[PDB]
Write a protein that binds this DNA or RNA. Structure first.
Ligand SMILES: [K+]
Ligand SMILES: [Mg+2]
Ligand SMILES: [Mg+2]
Ligand SMILES: [Mg+2]
Ligand SMILES: [Mg+2]
Lengths: 260, 290, 51, 247, 218
RNA sequence: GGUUCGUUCCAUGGAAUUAACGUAAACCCUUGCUUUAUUUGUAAAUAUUAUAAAGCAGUUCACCUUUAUAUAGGAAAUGAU
């Protein structure tokens, strides 16, 4: 059975000093991850996934509709803990190599700062904001930002459940509406028939999620409050989170090719 | 043209992709939650257990006897009951006999005995070879050639031998003895399917050699010296039983070598090699006088 | 091994297969080796010399 | 100087009681390499360079054992499987193990010498039939055939033989484009005529080597090896036996 | 006698005596086999001794001349009766695959049926209902039918939510741009096409066969 | 139980593992080709008959089919030779 594991740097007992109080982290991870895992266990209590890791379940249990509900819990548990394994008790100084490459893809550290934060509030829904490292056979390593609705896997092997666009407000009668509509059907028709829209390298190495940001309500609704009056709120939650990013660990997962 | 060139670029990109794919598999995997992996198919080979508990024996289907009709009333001493139309071998009866046999394998290996692990079935080759490595014994995963013990002079005529000592290292000076010496015979046979090969077990009893076998519900328990009532048709129980016996030999070999480093040999020269020493002194005596 | 058969393969160590043009005007005319013009040296590379 | 006080005989190879000790030891080694390097990627079958692996007999001789064909068939699969590994990623160990299964045999080469063409333009073909050996000198003539100095009608009285003598020119419809001067010796009437057929065929090919597929189907390329059988003692002829009296 | 005289139980006795004295009378006996001392203090177990087997059910007290006294008896538990009843009331519960491959055998250590149907390590199936039923019937002194009703009803509610999640999962997933593969319904129909076409060929052939076979009757 | 011209070959048997002879292989004649030799044989000749020493060559390759996946076979004037 899947069981809850400790956090990175004893955040369960102490929590981040200036980002999330210990009580908030308790309700955000210990009292939520346990709930998700409890449900997940009951689902895979007697299937092949009884001993598979979360990621393996995510990728494996993606295309199949009959197991959609299993993907949610497995993916949510993964993304949730993926979001806590990138914070740090004290702010870390951005690495030089990483600092340079960021400016080459986003123009500045602040340009990307306001993009991820802006994307969060723009969504107006629970989701995860990622930082993905794109790479193609001949194209150099290029970074980009991705938004995943509810439980969305940023990996290319889980393209079926990427959930990058809310079909409610993104498909209308306007010129953009029709364009978004075609893509929506093009993906469904392709996936259903088994055709591949965008070629991906074997092993799912094209995209590597480096950093994540959990925008779900339970995470920030307690410490920062409803946000009425702009004091605190979801906006402040994203801002404060930007100060605890463990840029050192972020650089490691980036695995940028030496080009300096 | 372009179709063939594509294959080239791919074949030239596998090394780079493999390295990157391996690195990415490290950090990403294990992040979501701790899995409680409590069973792996190849766990009885990578790390077999020292002793097998009732749970291990029941989890490996070591109690599924054969159909009620195809039974041997002789071995009704181990049957527990009847369910699903088959005889259920008592779990405790298996564990008791298994621990006993494990003690036999250990002592025989502790006294410098030559053990032979015999499993002759489609998927028993890796199990027997692994057990032999641990116990430093001989393996056999094919049809036992009839007459390799009673007629060893012919069958095992050309196979080479060697002479070792306390610390299992060659002894130069026995060149003349390794040509008149007759082939060896196993000091202990550990069969994993006595029902199949009865010609081997008969030569053991005919040559006064102890044997260990996995007696099923339809196997005659009078063929082997030490019985291990269990399910022989299961590749998962056979790996467990063999693993336990392999660790026994390993533990036995360890004690022997530990006692040899202290100048305490736990075995005296065999009768065959003993005779050579007597002849050696006789030939040497002539040189002294002459 | 005593009863095992032999496969038929070109033995390129045979004096007939080594040099297919036995004329000395071609073997000693700097075909492949250098400064072995002497006939005696060539023979030594083919037969065991006792002297 | 004397022997060690304690000593005991121990088998060298662990597979001491197996059918083929030397073979299984080498086979288990492969299986041991197919368990730690089995995760390395592979190459498509059609992209694997062709290797002439050893045969069952070769292994039997080099090992001195009687390895079973079935067991060797499954051992060869490991070689093919371990050979599909990417060369750059393939380890040195497997490489050393994959060179002992290669078959270094080279069949003998016997290239026949092509028939030249004289300065004046005559090709000399040779044919034989049952006693004879013809020598046809084919030039770019106009259809005048001379057999042993005489013409075709003065030498062969049977029109069946005249046609078969120059059949090569008739099948390819070149009777009026070549002059043939043949010299035949030995054999009878038809024996010599058939010999001239194969002779003109070979000579004609020297000028136009592209006619062999047609001559193949016309029956002017095969050397009929049928030969008069010898008389055997006890027999009236090659096979005829004297009257066997039962009583 | 198609059998052979096995003496595997006397290898030590026979070997020990052979190594007692030398064949050349007037010499010290040579060293015995290396295994003789290893199994010296480990005699073989007794075999071929038909005991009174374990009686898993009360033997017929009326039988005056009972037979098959040395025959193992059948193992019957109180659950067997309940399992038969439930699975007969829910035959399509057998189509739900159930794994009988034990992982480590320690699955009955965390089963506490006082809590409810849901347990650690085992899936929600008919067995959980039976064990829960048996618990209520024994501890809470309920009747077979009463305990059956209670536990059975809990089984339904847990299965209802499971089926509702599937529908709501796929539906909600498409609201945010989520596409899936071929459903089981579509796949099933495709396979029938390949099989139905094969039947058409066979039918056409045999039909033509009979037609040609009918020309010979006249 | 299959297979093969053949106790050949593969598989298998609660008994097999081997040796000698026969078989097979090899040899003699014969067939194509390569090299060597040119008289007493060959019209000429830069060598092609003949003469005779050694060497190579086949069911080899191609096609088709094929069992238990272990051992293979078919086709014969219109694949090569
Ligand atoms: K005749
Ligand atoms: Mg059995
Ligand atoms: Mg036989
Ligand atoms: Mg002359
Ligand atoms: Mg000639």
């Amino acid at each position: 059975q899947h069981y809850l594991m400790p956090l990175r740097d004893n955040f369960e007992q102490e929590g981040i000093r200036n980002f999330l109080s210990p009580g908030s982290v308790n309700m955000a991870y210990t009292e939520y991850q346990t709930f998700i895992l409890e449900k997940l266990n009951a689902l895979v209590v007697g299937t092949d996934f009884e001993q598979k890791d979360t990621k393996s379940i995510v990728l494996a249990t993606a295309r199949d509709p009959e197991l959609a509900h299993v993907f949610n819990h497995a993916s949510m548990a993964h993304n949730n803990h993926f979001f806590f394994d990138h914070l740090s008790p004290v702010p870390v100084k951005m690495g030089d190599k990483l600092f340079y490459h960021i400016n080459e893809n986003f123009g500045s550290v602040d340009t990307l700062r306001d993009e991820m934060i802006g994307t969060a509030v723009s969504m107006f829904g629970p989701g995860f904001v990622w930082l993905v490292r794109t790479q193609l056979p001949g194209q150099p390593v290029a970074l980009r930002v991705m938004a995943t609705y509810l439980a969305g896997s940023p990996y290319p092997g889980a393209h079926w459940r990427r959930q990058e666009m809310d079909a409610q407000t993104s498909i209308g009668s306007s010129p953009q509406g029709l364009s978004n509509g075609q893509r929506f059907f093009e993906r469904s028709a392709a996936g259903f028939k088994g055709n591949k829209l965008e070629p991906t390298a074997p092993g799912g190495t094209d995209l590597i999620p480096i950093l994540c940001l959990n925008t779900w309500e339970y995470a920030w609704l307690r410490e920062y409050g409803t946000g009425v009056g702009g004091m605190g709120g979801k906006l402040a939650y994203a801002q404060s989170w930007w100060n605890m990013i463990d840029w050192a660990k972020v650089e490691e997962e980036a695995r940028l090719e030496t080009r300096i | 043209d372009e179709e063939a060139l594509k294959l080239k670029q791919q074949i030239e990109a596998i090394p780079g992709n493999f390295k990157l794919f391996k690195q990415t598999k490290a950090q990403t995997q294990k992040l979501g939650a701790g899995v409680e992996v409590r069973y792996i198919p190849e766990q009885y080979l990578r790390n077999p257990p020292s002793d097998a508990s009732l749970e291990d024996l029941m989890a490996a289907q070591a109690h599924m006897g054969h159909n009620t009709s195809l039974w041997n009333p002789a071995n009704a001493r181990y049957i527990y009951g009847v369910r699903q139309g088959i005889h259920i071998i008592s779990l405790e009866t298996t564990a008791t006999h298994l621990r006993r046999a494990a003690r036999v394998v250990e002592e025989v290996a502790y006294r410098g005995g030559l053990i032979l692990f015999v499993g002759t079935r489609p998927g028993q080759r890796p199990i027997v070879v692994r057990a032999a490595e641990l116990a430093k014994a001989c393996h056999l995963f094919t049809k036992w050639r009839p007459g390799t013990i009673t007629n060893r002079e012919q069958l095992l005529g050309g196979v080479p031998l060697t002479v070792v000592d306390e610390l299992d290292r060659p002894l130069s000076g026995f060149e003349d003895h390794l040509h008149d010496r007759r082939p060896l015979a196993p000091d202990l046979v550990v069969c994993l399917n006595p029902k199949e090969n009865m010609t081997l077990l008969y030569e053991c009893s005919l040559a006064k050699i102890p044997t260990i076998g996995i007696i099923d519900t339809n196997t005659n328990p009078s063929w082997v010296t030490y019985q291990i009532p269990a399910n022989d048709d299961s590749l998962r129980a056979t790996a467990l039983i063999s693993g336990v016996l392999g660790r026994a030999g390993e533990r036995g070999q360890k004690r022997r070598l530990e006692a040899a480093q202290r100048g305490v040999v736990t075995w005296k020269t065999p009768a065959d090699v003993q005779g050579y020493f007597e002849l050696a002194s006789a030939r040497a005596a002539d040189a002294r006088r002459r | 091994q005593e009863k095992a058969s032999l496969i038929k393969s070109v033995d390129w160590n045979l004096l007939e297969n080594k040099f297919k043009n036995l004329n000395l005007s071609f073997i000693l005319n700097d075909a492949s080796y250098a400064e072995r013009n002497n006939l005696s040296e060539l023979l030594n590379k083919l037969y065991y010399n006792v002297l | 100087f004397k022997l060690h006080p304690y000593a005991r005989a121990v088998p060298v190879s662990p597979s001491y009681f197996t059918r083929t000790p030397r073979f299984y030891d080498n086979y288990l080694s492969l299986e041991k390499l197919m368990e730690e390097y089995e995760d390395l990627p592979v190459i498509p079958a059609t992209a694997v360079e062709r290797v002439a692996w050893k045969t069952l007999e070769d292994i039997r001789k080099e090992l001195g054992e009687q390895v079973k064909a079935s067991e060797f068939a499954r051992c060869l699969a490991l070689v093919k499987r371990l050979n599909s590994i990417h060369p750059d990623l393939k380890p040195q160990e497997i490489k050393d193990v994959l060179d002992s299964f290669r078959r270094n045999v080279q069949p003998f080469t016997n290239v026949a010498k092509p028939i030249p063409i004289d300065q004046f333009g005559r090709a000399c073909g040779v044919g034989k039939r049952k006693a004879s050996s013809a020598r046809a000198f084919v030039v770019e003539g106009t259809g005048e055939v001379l057999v042993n100095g005489k013409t075709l009608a003065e030498y062969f009285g049977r029109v069946h033989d005249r046609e078969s003598a120059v059949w090569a020119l008739r099948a390819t419809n070149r009777i009026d484009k070549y002059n043939v001067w043949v010299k035949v010796e030995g054999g009878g009437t038809t024996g010599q005529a058939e010999a001239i057929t194969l002779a003109i065929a070979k000579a004609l090919l020297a000028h136009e080597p592209a006619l062999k597929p047609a001559l193949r189907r016309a029956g002017c390329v095969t050397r009929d090896p049928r030969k008069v059988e010898r008389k055997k003692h006890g027999h009236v002829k090659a096979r005829k036996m004297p009257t066997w009296v039962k009583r | 006698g198609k059998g052979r005289i096995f003496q595997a139980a006397k290898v030590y006795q026979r070997a020990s005596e052979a190594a007692a004295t030398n064949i050349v009378s007037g010499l010290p006996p040579r060293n015995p086999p290396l295994w003789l001392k290893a199994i010296e203090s480990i005699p073989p177990a007794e075999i071929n001794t038909r005991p009174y087997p374990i009686q898993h059910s009360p033997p017929n007290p009326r039988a005056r001349k009972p037979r098959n006294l040395f025959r193992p008896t059948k193992i019957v538990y109180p659950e067997d009766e309940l399992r038969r009843d439930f699975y007969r009331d829910h035959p399509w519960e057998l189509a739900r695959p159930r794994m009988i491959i034990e992982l480590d055998g320690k699955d009955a250590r965390f089963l506490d049926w006082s809590k409810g149907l849901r347990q650690r390590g085992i899936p929600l199936s008919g067995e959980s209902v039976v064990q829960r039923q048996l618990w209520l019937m024994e501890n809470q002194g309920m009747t077979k039918q009463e305990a059956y009703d209670k536990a059975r009803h809990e089984f339904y509610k847990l299965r209802q939510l499971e089926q509702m999640e599937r529908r709501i999962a796929v539906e909600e997933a498409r609201m945010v741009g989520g596409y899936f593969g071929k459903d089981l319904l579509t796949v099933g129909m495709e396979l029938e096409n390949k099989t139905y076409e094969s039947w058409k060929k066979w039918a056409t052939t045999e039909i033509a066969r009979q037609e040609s076979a009918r020309a010979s009757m006249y």
